[PDB]
mmCIF file of C-alpha atoms in Angstrom:
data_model
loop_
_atom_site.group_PDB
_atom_site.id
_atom_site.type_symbol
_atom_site.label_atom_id
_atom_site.label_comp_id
_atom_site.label_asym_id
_atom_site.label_seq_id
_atom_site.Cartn_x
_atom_site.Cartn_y
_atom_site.Cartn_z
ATOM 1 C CA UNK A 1 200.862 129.851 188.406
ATOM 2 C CA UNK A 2 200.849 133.198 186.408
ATOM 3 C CA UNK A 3 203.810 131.756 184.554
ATOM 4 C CA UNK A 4 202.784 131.351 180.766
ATOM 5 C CA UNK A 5 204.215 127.871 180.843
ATOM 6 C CA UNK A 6 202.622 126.876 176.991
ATOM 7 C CA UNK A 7 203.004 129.209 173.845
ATOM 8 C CA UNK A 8 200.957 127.868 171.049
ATOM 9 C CA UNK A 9 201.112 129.836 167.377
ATOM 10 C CA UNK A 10 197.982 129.174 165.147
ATOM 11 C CA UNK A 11 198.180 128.823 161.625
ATOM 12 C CA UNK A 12 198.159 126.226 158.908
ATOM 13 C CA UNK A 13 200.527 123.646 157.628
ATOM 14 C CA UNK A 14 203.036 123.388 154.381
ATOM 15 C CA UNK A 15 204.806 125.548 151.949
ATOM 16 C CA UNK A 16 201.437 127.102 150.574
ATOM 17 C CA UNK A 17 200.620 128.669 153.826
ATOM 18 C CA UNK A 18 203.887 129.484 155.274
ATOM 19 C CA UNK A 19 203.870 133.216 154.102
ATOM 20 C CA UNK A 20 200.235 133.875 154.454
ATOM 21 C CA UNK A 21 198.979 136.191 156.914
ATOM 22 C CA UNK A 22 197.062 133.682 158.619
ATOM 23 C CA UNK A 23 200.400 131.689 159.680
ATOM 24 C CA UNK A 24 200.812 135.407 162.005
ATOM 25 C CA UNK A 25 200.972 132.909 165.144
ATOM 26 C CA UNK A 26 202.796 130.204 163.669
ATOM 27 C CA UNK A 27 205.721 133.469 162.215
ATOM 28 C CA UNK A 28 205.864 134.473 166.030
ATOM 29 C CA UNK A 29 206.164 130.880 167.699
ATOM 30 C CA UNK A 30 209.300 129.480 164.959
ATOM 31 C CA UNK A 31 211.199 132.730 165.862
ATOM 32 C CA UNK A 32 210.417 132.315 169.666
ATOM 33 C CA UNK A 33 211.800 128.699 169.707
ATOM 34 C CA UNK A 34 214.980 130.031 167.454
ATOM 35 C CA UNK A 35 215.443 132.810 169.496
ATOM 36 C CA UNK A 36 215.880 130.612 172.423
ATOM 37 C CA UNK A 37 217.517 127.106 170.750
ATOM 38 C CA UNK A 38 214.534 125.292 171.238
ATOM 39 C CA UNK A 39 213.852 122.851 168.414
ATOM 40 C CA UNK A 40 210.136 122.357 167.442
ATOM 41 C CA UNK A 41 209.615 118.266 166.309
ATOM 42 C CA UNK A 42 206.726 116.435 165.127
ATOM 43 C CA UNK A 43 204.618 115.451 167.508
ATOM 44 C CA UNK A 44 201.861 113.498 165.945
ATOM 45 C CA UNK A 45 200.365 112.024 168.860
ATOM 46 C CA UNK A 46 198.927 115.962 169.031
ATOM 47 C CA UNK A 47 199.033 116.105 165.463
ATOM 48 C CA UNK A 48 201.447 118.985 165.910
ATOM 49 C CA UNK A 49 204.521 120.339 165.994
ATOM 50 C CA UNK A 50 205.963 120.955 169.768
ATOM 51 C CA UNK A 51 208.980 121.781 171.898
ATOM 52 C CA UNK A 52 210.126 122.297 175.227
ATOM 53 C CA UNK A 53 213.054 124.322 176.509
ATOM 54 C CA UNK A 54 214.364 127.418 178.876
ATOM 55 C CA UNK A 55 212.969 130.661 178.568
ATOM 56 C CA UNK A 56 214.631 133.105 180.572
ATOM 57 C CA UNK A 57 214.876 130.623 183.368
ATOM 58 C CA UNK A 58 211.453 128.858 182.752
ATOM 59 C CA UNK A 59 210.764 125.890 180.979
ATOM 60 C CA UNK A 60 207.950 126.389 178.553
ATOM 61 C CA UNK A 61 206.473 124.182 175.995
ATOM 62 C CA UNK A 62 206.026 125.733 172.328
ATOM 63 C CA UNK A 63 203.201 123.943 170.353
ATOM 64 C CA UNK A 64 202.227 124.408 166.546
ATOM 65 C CA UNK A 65 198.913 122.793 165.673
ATOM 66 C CA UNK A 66 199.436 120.707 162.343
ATOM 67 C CA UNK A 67 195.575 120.483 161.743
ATOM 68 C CA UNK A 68 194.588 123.173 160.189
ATOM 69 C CA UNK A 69 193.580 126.324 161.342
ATOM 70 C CA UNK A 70 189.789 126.109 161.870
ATOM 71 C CA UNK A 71 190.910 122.399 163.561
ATOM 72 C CA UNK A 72 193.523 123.312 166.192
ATOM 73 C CA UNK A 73 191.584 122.397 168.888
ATOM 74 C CA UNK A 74 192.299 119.294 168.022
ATOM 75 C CA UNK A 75 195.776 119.537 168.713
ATOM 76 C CA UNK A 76 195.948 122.558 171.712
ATOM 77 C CA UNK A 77 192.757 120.460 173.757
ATOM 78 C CA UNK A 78 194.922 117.208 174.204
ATOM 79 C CA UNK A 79 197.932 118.600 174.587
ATOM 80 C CA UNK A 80 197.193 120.983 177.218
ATOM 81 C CA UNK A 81 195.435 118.033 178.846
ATOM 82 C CA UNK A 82 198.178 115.479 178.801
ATOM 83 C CA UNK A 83 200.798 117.994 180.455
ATOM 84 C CA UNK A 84 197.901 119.376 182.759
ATOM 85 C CA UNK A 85 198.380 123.044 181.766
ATOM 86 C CA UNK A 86 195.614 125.144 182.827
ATOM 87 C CA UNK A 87 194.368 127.833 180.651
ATOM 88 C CA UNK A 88 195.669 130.345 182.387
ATOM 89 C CA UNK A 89 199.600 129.331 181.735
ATOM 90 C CA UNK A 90 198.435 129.716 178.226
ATOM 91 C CA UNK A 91 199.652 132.325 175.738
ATOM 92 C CA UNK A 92 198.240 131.428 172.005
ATOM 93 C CA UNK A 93 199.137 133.795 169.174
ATOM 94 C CA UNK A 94 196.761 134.329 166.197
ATOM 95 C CA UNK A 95 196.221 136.864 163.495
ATOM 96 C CA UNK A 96 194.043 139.526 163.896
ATOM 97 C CA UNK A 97 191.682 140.723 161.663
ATOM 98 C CA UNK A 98 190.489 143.756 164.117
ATOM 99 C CA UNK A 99 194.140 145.678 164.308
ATOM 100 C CA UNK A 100 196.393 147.031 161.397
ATOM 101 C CA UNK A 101 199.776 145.733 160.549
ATOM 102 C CA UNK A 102 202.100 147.149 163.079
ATOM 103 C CA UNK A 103 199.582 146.605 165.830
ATOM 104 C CA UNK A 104 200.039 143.924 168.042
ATOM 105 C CA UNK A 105 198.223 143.435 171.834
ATOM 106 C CA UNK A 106 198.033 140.744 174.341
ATOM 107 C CA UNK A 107 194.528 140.372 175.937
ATOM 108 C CA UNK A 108 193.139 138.134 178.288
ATOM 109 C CA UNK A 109 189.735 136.085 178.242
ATOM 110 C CA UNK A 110 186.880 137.051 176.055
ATOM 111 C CA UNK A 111 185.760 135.541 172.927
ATOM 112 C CA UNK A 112 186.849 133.920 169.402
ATOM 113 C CA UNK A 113 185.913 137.536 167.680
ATOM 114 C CA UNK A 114 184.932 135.668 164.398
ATOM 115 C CA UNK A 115 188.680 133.740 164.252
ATOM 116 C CA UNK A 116 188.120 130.486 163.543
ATOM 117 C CA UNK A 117 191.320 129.087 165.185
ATOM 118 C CA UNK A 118 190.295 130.286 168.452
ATOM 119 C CA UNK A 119 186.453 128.861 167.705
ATOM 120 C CA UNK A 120 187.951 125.716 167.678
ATOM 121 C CA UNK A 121 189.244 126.100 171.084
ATOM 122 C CA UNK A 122 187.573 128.291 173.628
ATOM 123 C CA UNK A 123 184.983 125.504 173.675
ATOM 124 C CA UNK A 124 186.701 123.036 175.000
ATOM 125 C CA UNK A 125 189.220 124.881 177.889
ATOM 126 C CA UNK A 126 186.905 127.722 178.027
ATOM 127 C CA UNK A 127 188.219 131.172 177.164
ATOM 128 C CA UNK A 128 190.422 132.627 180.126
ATOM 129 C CA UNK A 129 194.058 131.663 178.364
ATOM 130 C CA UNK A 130 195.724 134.872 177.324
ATOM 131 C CA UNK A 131 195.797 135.998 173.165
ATOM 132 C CA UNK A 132 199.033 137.606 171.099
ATOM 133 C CA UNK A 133 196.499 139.705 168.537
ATOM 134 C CA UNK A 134 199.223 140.125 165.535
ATOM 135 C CA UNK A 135 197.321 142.484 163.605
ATOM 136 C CA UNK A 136 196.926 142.126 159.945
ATOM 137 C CA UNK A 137 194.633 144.426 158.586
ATOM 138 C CA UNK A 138 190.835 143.802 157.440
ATOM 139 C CA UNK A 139 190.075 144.323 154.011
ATOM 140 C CA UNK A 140 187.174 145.872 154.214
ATOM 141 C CA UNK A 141 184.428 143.393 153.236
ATOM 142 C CA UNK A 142 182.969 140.044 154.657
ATOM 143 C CA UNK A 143 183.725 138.763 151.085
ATOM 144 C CA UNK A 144 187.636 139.529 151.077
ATOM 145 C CA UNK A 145 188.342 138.285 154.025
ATOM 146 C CA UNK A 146 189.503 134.773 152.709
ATOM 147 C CA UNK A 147 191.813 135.794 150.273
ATOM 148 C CA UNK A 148 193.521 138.447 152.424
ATOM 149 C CA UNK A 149 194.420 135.519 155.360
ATOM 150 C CA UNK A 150 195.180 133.224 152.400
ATOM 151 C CA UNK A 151 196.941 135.646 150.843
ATOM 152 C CA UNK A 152 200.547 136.944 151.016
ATOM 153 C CA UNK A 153 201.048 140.475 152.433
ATOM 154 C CA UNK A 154 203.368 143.464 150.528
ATOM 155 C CA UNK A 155 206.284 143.786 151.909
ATOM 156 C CA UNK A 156 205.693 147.305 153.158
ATOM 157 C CA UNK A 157 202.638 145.340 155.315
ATOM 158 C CA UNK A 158 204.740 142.295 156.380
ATOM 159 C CA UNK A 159 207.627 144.526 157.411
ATOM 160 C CA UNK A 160 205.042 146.280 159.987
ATOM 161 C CA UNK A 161 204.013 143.181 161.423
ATOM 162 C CA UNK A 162 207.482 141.872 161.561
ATOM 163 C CA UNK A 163 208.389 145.250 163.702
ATOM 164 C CA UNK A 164 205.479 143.766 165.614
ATOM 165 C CA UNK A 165 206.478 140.187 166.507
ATOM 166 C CA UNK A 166 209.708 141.514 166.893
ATOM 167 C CA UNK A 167 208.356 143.872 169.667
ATOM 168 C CA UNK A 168 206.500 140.728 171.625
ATOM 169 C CA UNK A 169 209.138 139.091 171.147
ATOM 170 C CA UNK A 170 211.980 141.032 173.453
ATOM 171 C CA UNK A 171 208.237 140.951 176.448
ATOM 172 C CA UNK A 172 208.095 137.118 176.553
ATOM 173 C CA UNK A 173 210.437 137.060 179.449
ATOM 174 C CA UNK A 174 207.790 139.060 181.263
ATOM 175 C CA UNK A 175 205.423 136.702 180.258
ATOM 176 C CA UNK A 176 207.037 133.380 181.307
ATOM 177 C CA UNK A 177 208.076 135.050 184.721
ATOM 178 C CA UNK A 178 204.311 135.803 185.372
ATOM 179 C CA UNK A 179 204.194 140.004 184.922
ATOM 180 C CA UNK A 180 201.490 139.741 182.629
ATOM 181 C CA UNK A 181 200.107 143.525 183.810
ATOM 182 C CA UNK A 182 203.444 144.792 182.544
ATOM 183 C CA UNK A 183 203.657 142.608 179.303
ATOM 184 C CA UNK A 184 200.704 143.862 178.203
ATOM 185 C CA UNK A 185 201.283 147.523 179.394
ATOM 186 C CA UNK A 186 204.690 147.161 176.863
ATOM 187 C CA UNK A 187 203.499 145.372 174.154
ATOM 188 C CA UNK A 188 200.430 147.112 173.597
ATOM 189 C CA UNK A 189 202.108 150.304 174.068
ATOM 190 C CA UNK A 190 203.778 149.455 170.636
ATOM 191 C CA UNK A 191 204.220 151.911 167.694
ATOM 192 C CA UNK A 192 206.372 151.565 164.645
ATOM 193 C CA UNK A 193 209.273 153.549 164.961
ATOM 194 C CA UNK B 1 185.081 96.370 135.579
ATOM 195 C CA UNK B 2 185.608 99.416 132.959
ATOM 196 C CA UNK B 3 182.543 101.288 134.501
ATOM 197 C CA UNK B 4 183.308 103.784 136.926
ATOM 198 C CA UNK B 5 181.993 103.205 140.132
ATOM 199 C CA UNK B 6 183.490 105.893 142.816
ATOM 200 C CA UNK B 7 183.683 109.681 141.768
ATOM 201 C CA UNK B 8 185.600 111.587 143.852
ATOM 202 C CA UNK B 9 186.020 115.630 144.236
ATOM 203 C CA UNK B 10 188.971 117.137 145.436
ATOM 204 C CA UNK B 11 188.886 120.297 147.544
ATOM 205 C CA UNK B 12 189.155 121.991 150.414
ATOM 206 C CA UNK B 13 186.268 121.928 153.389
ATOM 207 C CA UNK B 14 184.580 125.321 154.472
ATOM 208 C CA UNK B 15 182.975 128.285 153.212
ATOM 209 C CA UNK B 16 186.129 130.407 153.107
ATOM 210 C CA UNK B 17 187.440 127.442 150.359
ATOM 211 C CA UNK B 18 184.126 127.201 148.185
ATOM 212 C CA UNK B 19 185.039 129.651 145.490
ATOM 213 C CA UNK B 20 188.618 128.798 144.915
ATOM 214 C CA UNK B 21 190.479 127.384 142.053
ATOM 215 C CA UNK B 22 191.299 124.387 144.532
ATOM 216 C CA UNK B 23 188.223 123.517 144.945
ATOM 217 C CA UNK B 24 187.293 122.552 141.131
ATOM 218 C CA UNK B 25 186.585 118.615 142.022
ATOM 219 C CA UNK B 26 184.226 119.615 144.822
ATOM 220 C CA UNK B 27 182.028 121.695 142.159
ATOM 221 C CA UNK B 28 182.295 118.792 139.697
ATOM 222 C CA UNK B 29 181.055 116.553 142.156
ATOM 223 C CA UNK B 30 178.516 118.521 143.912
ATOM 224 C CA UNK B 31 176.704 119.430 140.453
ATOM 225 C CA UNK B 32 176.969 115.886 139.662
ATOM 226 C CA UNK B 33 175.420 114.607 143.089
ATOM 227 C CA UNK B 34 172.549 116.936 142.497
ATOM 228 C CA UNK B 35 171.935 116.566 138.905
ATOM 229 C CA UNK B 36 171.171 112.935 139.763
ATOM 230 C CA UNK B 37 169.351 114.007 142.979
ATOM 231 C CA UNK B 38 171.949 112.124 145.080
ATOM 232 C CA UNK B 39 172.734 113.535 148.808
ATOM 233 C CA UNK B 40 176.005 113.728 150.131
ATOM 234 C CA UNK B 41 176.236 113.313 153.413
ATOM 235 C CA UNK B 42 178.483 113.565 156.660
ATOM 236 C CA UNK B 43 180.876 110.625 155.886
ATOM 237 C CA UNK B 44 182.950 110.978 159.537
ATOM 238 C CA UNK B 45 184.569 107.231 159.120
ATOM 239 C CA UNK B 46 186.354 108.196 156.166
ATOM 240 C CA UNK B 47 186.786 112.031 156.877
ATOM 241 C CA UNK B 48 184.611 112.856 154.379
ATOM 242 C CA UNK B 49 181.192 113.596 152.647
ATOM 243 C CA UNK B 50 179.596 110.535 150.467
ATOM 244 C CA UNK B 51 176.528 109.758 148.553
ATOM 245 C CA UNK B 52 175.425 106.963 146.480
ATOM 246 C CA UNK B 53 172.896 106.524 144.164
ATOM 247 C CA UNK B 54 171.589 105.946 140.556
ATOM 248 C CA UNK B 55 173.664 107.277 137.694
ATOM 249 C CA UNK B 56 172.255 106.083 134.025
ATOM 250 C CA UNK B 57 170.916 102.869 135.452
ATOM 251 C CA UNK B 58 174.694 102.055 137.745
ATOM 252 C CA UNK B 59 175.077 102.401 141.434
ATOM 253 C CA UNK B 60 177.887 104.929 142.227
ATOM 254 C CA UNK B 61 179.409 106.021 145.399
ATOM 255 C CA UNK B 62 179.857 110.057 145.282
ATOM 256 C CA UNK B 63 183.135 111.003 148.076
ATOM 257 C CA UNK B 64 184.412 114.716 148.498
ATOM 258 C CA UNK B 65 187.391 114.154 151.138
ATOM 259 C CA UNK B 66 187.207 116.733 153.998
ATOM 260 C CA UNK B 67 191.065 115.811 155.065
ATOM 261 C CA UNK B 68 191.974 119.083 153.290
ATOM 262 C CA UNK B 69 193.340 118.403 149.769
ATOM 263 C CA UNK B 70 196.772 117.542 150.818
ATOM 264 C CA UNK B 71 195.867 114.638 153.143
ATOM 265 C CA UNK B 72 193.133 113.367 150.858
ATOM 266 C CA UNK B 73 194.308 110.039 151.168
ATOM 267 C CA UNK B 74 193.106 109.602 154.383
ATOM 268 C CA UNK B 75 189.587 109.509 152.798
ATOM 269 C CA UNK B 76 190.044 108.171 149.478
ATOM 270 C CA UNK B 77 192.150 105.210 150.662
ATOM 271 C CA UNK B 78 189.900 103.358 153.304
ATOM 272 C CA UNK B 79 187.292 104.123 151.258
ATOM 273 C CA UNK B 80 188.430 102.730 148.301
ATOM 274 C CA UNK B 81 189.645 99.396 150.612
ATOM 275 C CA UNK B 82 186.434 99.365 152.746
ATOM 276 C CA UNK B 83 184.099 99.494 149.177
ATOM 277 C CA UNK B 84 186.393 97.325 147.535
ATOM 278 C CA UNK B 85 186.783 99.793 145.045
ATOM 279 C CA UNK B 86 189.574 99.083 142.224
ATOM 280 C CA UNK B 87 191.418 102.159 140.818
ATOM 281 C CA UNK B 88 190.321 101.202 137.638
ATOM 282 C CA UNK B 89 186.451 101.932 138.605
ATOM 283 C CA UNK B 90 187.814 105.509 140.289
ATOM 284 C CA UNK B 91 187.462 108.828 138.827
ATOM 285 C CA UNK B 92 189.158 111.601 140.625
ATOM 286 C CA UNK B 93 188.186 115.245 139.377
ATOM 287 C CA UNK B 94 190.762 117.880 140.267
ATOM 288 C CA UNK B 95 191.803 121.527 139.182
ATOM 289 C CA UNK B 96 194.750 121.635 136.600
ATOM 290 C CA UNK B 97 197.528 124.443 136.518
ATOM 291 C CA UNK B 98 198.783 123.032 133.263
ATOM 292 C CA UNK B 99 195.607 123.691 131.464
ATOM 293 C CA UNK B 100 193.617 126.896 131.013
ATOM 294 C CA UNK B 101 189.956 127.678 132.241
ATOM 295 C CA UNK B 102 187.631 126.239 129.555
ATOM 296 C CA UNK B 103 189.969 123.488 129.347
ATOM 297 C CA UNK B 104 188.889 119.894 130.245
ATOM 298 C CA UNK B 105 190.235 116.449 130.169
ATOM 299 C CA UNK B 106 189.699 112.763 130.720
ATOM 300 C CA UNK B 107 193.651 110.852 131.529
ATOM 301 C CA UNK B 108 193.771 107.567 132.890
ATOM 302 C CA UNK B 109 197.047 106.774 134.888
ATOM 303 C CA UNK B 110 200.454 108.974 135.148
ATOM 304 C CA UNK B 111 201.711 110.891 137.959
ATOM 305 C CA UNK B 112 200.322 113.904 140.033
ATOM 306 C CA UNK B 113 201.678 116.447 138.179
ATOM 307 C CA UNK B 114 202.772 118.502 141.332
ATOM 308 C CA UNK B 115 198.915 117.956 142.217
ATOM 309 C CA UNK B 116 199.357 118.214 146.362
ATOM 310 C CA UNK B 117 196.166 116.575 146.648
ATOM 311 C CA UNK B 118 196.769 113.486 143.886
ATOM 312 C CA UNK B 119 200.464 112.894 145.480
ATOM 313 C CA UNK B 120 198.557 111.912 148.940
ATOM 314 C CA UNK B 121 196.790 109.346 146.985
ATOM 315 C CA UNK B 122 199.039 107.816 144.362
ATOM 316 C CA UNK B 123 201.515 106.630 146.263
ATOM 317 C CA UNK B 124 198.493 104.279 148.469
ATOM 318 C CA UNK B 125 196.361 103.329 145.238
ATOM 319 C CA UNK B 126 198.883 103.164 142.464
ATOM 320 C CA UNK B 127 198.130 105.430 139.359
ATOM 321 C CA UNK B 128 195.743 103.852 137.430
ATOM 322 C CA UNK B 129 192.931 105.500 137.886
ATOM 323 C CA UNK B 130 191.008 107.829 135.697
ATOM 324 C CA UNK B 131 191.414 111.926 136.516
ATOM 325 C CA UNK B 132 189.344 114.855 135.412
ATOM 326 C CA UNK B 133 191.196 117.329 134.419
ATOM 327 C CA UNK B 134 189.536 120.605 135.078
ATOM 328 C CA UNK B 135 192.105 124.015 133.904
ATOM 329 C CA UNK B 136 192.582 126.994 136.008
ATOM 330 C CA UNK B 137 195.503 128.126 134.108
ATOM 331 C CA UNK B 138 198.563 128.859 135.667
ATOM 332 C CA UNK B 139 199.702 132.452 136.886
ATOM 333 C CA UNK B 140 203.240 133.783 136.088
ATOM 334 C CA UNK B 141 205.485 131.857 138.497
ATOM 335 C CA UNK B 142 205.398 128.915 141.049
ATOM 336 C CA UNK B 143 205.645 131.822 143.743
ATOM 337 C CA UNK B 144 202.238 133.242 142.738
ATOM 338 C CA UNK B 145 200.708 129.384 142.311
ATOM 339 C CA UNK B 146 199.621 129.377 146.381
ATOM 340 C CA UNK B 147 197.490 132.781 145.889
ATOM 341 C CA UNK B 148 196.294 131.604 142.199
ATOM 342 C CA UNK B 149 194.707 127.727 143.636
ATOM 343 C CA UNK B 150 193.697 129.495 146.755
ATOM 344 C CA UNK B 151 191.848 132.772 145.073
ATOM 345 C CA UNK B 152 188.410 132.745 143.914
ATOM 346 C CA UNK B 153 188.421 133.424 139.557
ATOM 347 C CA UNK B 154 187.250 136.602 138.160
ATOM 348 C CA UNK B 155 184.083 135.944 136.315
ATOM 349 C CA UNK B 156 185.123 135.700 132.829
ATOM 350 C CA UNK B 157 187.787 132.807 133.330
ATOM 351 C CA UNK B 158 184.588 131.064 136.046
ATOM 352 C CA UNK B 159 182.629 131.003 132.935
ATOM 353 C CA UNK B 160 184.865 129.314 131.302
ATOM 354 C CA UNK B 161 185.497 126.322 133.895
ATOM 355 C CA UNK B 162 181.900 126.341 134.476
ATOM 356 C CA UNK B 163 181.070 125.730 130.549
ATOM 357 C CA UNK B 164 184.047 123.146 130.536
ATOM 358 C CA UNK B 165 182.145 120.936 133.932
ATOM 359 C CA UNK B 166 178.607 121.261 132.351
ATOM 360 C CA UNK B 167 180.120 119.080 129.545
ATOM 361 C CA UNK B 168 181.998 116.896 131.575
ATOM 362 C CA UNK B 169 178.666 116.326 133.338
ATOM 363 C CA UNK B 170 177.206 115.074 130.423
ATOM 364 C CA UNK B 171 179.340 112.605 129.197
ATOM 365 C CA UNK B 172 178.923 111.008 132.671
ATOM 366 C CA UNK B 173 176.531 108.522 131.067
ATOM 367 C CA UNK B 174 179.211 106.929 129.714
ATOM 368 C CA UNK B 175 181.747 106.809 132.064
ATOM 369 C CA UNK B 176 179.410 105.177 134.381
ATOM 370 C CA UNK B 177 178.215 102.841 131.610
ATOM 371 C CA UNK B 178 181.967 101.369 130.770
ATOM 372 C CA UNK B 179 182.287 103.217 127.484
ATOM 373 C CA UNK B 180 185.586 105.248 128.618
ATOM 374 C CA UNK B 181 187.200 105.789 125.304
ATOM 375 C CA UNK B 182 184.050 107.276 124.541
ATOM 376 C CA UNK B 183 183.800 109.746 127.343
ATOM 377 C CA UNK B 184 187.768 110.288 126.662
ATOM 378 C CA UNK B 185 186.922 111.665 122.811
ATOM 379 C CA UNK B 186 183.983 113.722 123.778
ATOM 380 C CA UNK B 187 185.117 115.102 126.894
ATOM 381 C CA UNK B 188 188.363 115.692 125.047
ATOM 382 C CA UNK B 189 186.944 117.408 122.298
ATOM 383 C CA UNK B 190 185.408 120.402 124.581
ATOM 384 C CA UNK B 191 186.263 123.687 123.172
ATOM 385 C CA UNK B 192 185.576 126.659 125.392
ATOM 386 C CA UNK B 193 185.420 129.178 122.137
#
């Protein structure tokens, strides 16, 4: 219903990427499936990585696209088809360009705001599944842009967005019950301490 | 049999990959397929982009793999089958950690060198086909190698690697023409100062 029954983390695949800020979704996703014992396995016939478990008395599915970022639709499309999970059950968590390090918001509907994870998917299931916006920062110029999401943050920067995740992470149970009004009233009430 | 037949660039696809180290094979290849006016094209059966066209009087297939480099098997292997291409006839042009910018070399055979995008093709087609060798140098530290391959040069060390391909480019005549320990000595013999 309002249950967020599917929690898909955006990022890309391997050791090169792992650490990058643009693996924000994928950072929140691994420690929501750990946090709960739910193992994430290859899943190639969505050319991802997925998992299903309990979630404070739910079961949700936990999907990370293996296709590359600016390809995930190639994974999230199918596999939200095949279980027959509408958009609206769907939380996907992304880096955010648009809100410092230490910032994080959930939002509902509306566009891919230049992210090229999300442009791969609002086209296909349309754009009213809800958003974890991790924020990382924007360097200040069109032509840095690449080499900050490719890049590794400080550690002063990733221990921010850490505080972050960490925050969203203690409001999923709010999330897979439904209370979306109050998980976004709490998580985007977030401030570093 | 000892004329080269397919050149392949390796890279990564996309604007936000263009500039980077990575992506040394794709501007090899790209200033080769236009300084013989051949187009490359939208290749979608073998996940790629392909030309073909006359080089020095020889008909040669031009591929730049859009798998991302470390799944560039998937276009340089059916490819290669579908052509009936041997290894032999196959150079591969790729950016080299172990040698500095200005660097350049011809190798035919060995290993991939901890080359993510030659280990996804080895291992289908065997080693024996010919590699350029295009140096990026190497930062401190296998840590820092992710941000080095995908960061964009400072200008100095892009001069360099851009000298180094404009003489590859011209020894192409005799790659294409058979005469490979020929190509090997005077691409070998490039010195960048």
């Amino acid at each position: 219903m309002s249950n967020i029954s599917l929690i898909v983390g955006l990022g890309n695949p391997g050791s090169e990427y792992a650490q990058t800020r643009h693996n924000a979704g994928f950072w929140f996703v691994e420690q929501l499936a750990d946090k709960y014992g739910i193992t994430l396995k290859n899943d190639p016939k969505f050319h991802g990585i997925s998992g299903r478990g309990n979630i404070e008395g739910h079961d949700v599915r936990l999907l990370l696209p293996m296709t590359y970022m600016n390809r995930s639709g190639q994974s999230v499309v199918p596999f939200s088809k095949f279980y027959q999970i509408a958009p609206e059950a769907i939380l996907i968590a992304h880096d955010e360009l648009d809100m410092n390090p230490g910032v994080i918001r959930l939002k509902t509907g509306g566009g891919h705001g230049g992210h090229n994870g999300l442009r791969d998917i609002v086209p296909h299931i349309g754009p009213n599944f809800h958003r974890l916006r991790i924020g990382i920062g924007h360097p200040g110029s069109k032509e840095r842009v690449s080499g900050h999401v490719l890049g590794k943050a400080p550690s002063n920067e990733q221990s921010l967005m850490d505080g972050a995740i960490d925050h969203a992470l203690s409001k999923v149970k709010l999330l897979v019950q439904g209370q979306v009004p109050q998980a976004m009233n709490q998580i985007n009430a977030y401030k570093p301490a």
